[PDB]
Write a protein that binds this ligand. Structure first.
Ligand SMILES: Nc1ncnc2c1ncn2[C@@H]1O[C@H](COP(=O)(O)OP(=O)(O)O)[C@@H](O)[C@H]1O
Ligand SMILES: [Mg+2]
Lengths: 52, 532, 195
């Protein structure tokens, strides 16, 4: 259910077969990191995207 | 007329009920605050016994029905998670805040004004703590860490044992120190494996200069001591090879059955030979090892341990420099194992601890790790020692991360109460009353500390307030900010001089969490309880 | 006495509160009776021979090293086996199988041996049908054993273990730690170096 949101945000295009997995279907991002919330959990954040 | 299938409470009734629930939760743990506090012994109605002083443990073990009380219980849990210390103090402060706020509301003060006053008082208290009541640890040194650990371990089963346990905790914390990017020294607690075993006295607790495993060798034929260990960490089981679901063996020529059956084990034999050909001495795997590979390792005179915990294996690999190998497959499509994947340690020994044995990995190279073996009189005392040790480790981590500490023994509470009582007169007309009640509510901690010691709480708190008022009024007597409570003799005492310290983050986070909990409970004026 | 066709009105709507007040208790009673009747009436109405390993199993076994009935089975995981025990004080034969279950629990921690009297939970079940080894797995009866004294006697833990294992109901059996190791489980911030 989150594929549409992820593709709209990052700019990636889903790949269903390795034949079509090319560079132009990737979404460039400035930073992708996992941050811990002071011991209350871990959050994966992707901040900064070309053509957001 | 509502025709709602349930019960409804509205007005002063529900507010009084919520305050009653919060006060009851506070009174449950109010007797276990400060060095003169005493532990509680819980029974789980199946014979299980838990003796503890930690507020979070007590509130988690108890089953609570009222939701406003569940709010305080999960508040204590949150304080334990985000700080690790001050778990009872935050609950007590939140309950006192709720009680005084309810008194204000019953005096026909609107709850919104009380909430605004509480927010202003919390913000100004945090600002005053940050600007007036902090001591840098740079000019103190290791003595500051030792004193913080000793203060944390007071009111615990390792209180008088503090002179030794503080050194142990400080060494354990400093052993696991590492610096990440931006050059920030981050201290990763919970990487110190805490192993408990009843037996000798608490003085006999050992701090391992390495890592301690709660597991033994898989076969009695293997040696129980290897000097120059070459640890090989694996994440796959070493058993007879079995084909997956998508592969099925069908035999039409009967001559191939013996070859098939032989290869089924020769695959694992070849894997073991490849692993051992690099000089590996200790082999650790998260999966199981059957008897065949155990005999392979026996003949080579090497360690082999099965069913190792994943976190223990990761810590061992990181400390010794080994690499976890979930599979044997390089980028060439082959199946090989090289010596670059081997970790090193100065000694690996299977030691005996009170009729039971455990594996000690001593002096790992390329990284220093630590573990603590706690010796006690029975299981309950070992559990309480473990909890208190975790509290002390968290306190030391907070002190080493943020280099600011605050005086203990309720000095901060008294200073905040005096400052906020003075400050309330400069803001509003009813938020003035809210801030005054916040200041009065902050006095519950020294009152409880004095009461638990069977001392004259009124006189002691009055003297403390007089000292702090003189400090705040006179600008040439600012050294009285450190005057706290000496519960051994029941007299005011300069706690900074006496070495009673707490991390500033403990006070700040406790105040913020208590303020939010009180605000959340205070917003309710009606309750609908639907029938299940 | 006419005008039976009424189709009534909001009158019953005005009494939905008491209707549901009584209906919740009635439904709870119906659930309790349904869980009771799943066994009652449904089951109440209807030299290798010397076991050379019995002695070794016995000597290794001694190496020790109303609403509740509904609530303890309604909750918790369905993947574990619960062997409910039925007994009444005074009638002989309960103590032997109670001790057998106590011994079995040592070697089978997965099983959830529990005991409950008949009084708290029928007359024909109380007079001469007290000993029942109710085995619950997945919320439904897998073992409905009654009159177990005939095939057991008046028997050690080995007999009960064999009787339960011959029907494939006992989970497969699986060291002594110092006391414990674990203290928590979360993002524990494992060791790193960074250079
Ligand atoms: N040696 C000491 N002298 C005076 N007060 C102390 C001393 N050690 C601790 N205290 C105070 O006792 C209070 C209770 O702390 P404690 O209840 O042990 O922490 P927690 O609330 O996490 O259980 C702390 O606020 C601390 O200021
Ligand atoms: Mg404490």
């Amino acid at each position: 259910e989150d594929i549409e949101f992820i593709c709209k945000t990052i700019g990636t295009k889903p790949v269903a077969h390795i034949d079509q997995f090319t560079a132009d279907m990737l979404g460039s991002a400035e930073l992708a990191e996992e941050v811990n919330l002071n011991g209350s959990g871990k959050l994966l954040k992707i901040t900064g995207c070309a053509s957001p | 007329p509502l025709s709602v299938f349930g019960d409804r409470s509205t007005g002063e009734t529900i507010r009084s009920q919520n305050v009653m629930a919060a006060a009851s939760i506070a009174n449950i743990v109010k007797s276990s605050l400060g060095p003169v506090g005493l532990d509680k012994m819980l029974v789980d109605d199946i014979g299980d016994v838990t003796i503890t002083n930690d507020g979070a443990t007590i509130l988690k073990l108890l089953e609570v029905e009222h939701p406003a009380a569940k709010v305080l219980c999960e508040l204590a849990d949150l304080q334990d998670k985000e700080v690790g210390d001050g778990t009872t103090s935050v609950v007590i402060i939140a309950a006192e805040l709720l009680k005084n706020a309810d008194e204000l509301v019953k005096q026909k003060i609107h709850p919104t004004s009380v909430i605004s006053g509480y927010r202003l008082a919390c913000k100004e208290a945090v600002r005053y703590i940050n600007e007036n009541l902090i001591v840098n640890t740079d000019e103190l040194g290791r003595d500051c860490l030792i004193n913080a650990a000793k203060t944390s371990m007071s009111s615990k089963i390792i209180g008088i044992n503090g002179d030794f346990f503080a050194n142990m905790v400080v060494d354990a914390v400093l052993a696991i120190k590492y610096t990440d990017i931006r050059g920030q020294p981050r201290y990763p607690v919970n990487s110190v494996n805490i192993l408990k075993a009843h037996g000798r006295s608490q003085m006999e607790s050992m701090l391992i200069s390495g890592y301690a495993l709660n597991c033994v060798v898989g076969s009695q034929g293997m040696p129980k001591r290897i000097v120059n260990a070459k640890i090989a960490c694996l994440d796959f089981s070493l058993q007879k090879t079995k084909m997956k679901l998508g592969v099925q063996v069908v035999i039409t020529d009967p001559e191939k059955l013996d070859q098939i059956r032989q290869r089924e084990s020769d695959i694992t034999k070849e894997r073991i030979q490849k692993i051992l050909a690099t000089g590996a001495n200790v082999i650790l795997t998260t999966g199981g090892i059957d008897d065949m590979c155990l005999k392979y390792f026996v003949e080579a005179g090497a360690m082999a341990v099965r069913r190792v915990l994943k976190r223990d294996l990761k810590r061992i690999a990181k400390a010794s420099g080994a690499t976890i190998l979930s599979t044997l497959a390089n980028l060439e499509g082959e199946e090989t194992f090289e010596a670059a994947m081997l970790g090193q340690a100065e000694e690996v020994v299977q030691e005996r601890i009170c009729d039971d044995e455990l594996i000690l990995i001593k002096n790992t190279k390329a990284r220093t790790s630590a573990s603590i073996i706690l010796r006690g009189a029975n299981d309950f005392m070992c559990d309480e020692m473990e909890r208190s040790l975790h509290d002390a480790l968290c306190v030391v981590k907070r002190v080493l991360e943020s280099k600011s500490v605050v005086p203990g023994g309720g000095a901060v509470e008294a200073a905040l109460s005096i400052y906020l009582e003075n400050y309330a007169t400069s803001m509003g007309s009813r938020e003035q009353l809210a801030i005054a009640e916040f200041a009065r509510s902050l006095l519950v901690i020294p009152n409880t500390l004095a009461v638990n010691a069977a001392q004259d709480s009124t006189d002691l708190v009055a003297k403390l307030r007089a000292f702090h008022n003189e400090a705040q009024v006179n600008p040439e007597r600012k050294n009285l900010k450190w005057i706290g409570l000496d519960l051994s003799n029941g007299k005011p005492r300069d706690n900074k001089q006496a070495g009673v310290f707490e991390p500033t983050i403990v006070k700040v986070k406790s105040l913020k969490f208590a303020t939010e909990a009180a605000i959340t409970i205070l917003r309710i004026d009606d309750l609908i309880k639907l029938h299940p | 006495l006419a005008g039976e066709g009424i189709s009534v009105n909001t009158g019953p709507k005005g009494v939905i509160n008491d209707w549901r007040r009584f209906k919740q208790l009635e439904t709870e009673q119906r659930e309790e009776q349904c869980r009771e009747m799943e066994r009652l009436i449904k089951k109440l109405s209807m030299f290798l021979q010397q076991y050379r390993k019995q002695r070794m199993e016995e000597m290794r076994q001694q190496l020790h090293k109303g609403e509740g009935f509904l609530d303890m089975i309604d909750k918790e995981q369905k993947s574990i086996v619960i062997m409910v025990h039925i007994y009444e004080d005074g009638i002989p034969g309960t103590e032997a199988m109670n001790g057998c279950m106590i011994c079995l629990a040592a070697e089978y921690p997965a099983v959830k041996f529990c005991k409950v009297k008949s009084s708290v939970i029928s007359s024909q079940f109380t007079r001469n049908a007290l000993p029942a080894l109710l085995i619950y797995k997945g919320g439904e009866l897998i073992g409905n054993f009654v009159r177990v004294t005939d095939q057991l006697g008046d028997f050690f833990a080995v007999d009960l273990e064999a009787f339960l294992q011959e029907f494939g109901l006992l989970p497969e059996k699986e060291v002594l730690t110092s006391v414990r190791n674990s203290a928590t489980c979360h993002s524990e911030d494992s060791d790193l170096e960074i250079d």
